[PDB]
């Protein structure tokens, strides 16, 4: 299959037409997405097959063909770009200064950008173009708007 | 079957659209991986 580094759409034909269920990142031969996108199911790339390798429903992350590769982190200071890939529209970089998810276990970056659920898995990047997390698991605020965690895995 | 299609390179793009705020939010994470507002 297509193993080229970059951002990808995740599609299904299980509904009407072809429907975009989410997005992911190919890096070092590994596909990274959010667990709620695939539910751990295998994926096609042409006539090539991608099998899950690693996942955790709590982190809401899953990796295909290998272990989680993405180990960059928000520095807690600088702005970032959501490389948003919405259903039926072109990849578009959107720059923002993360807010904070304050949890009993620690502080997490959060990005206040609203997009259709099919955008889940779009990468978040630092000034050097490194993926510091994935967009699409978070919360609905006072306003009715959506705030996402910057969800990052652990590299071993 | 779900399938993947490439949508672009992973690149910082200088002079991109700058938007969204930066809220500090009190949240809880459940065993099912769903965030919620602690208040
Ligand atoms: C069932 C489920 N839907 C999501 C979800 C992901 C991403 C975005 C941008 C969303 N926006 C509004 C509502 C839900 C969203 C998480 N889990």
Structure notes:
The complex is a heterodimer of chains A (about 160) and B (about 40). Chain A has about 160 residues and is mainly β. Chain A has two domains: about 60 residues, Thrombin, subunit H, CATH 2.40.10; about 70 residues, Trypsin-like serine proteases (Thrombin, subunit H, Beta Barrel). Helix content of chain A is about 5%, strand content about 45%. Chain A has one helix and 15 strands. In chain A, the strands form four sheets. In chain A, strands 1-2-3-7-6 form a five-stranded antiparallel β-sheet. In chain A, strand 14 and strand 15 form a beta hairpin. The longest helix of chain A is centred in the N-terminal third of the chain and has 4 residues. Chain A is globular. Chain B is flat, with a radius of gyration of 17 Å. In chain B, strand 3 and strand 4 form a beta hairpin. Helices cover about 0% and strands about 45% of the residues of chain B. Chain B is mostly beta strands and about 40 residues long. Chain B has a two-stranded antiparallel ribbon with strand order 3-4. Strand 4 of chain A pairs parallel with strand 1 of chain B. The site of (5P)-8-methyl-5-(2-methyl-1H-imidazol-4-yl)quinoline has 7 residues of chain A, from loops. (5P)-8-methyl-5-(2-methyl-1H-imidazol-4-yl)quinoline binds next to loops of chain A.
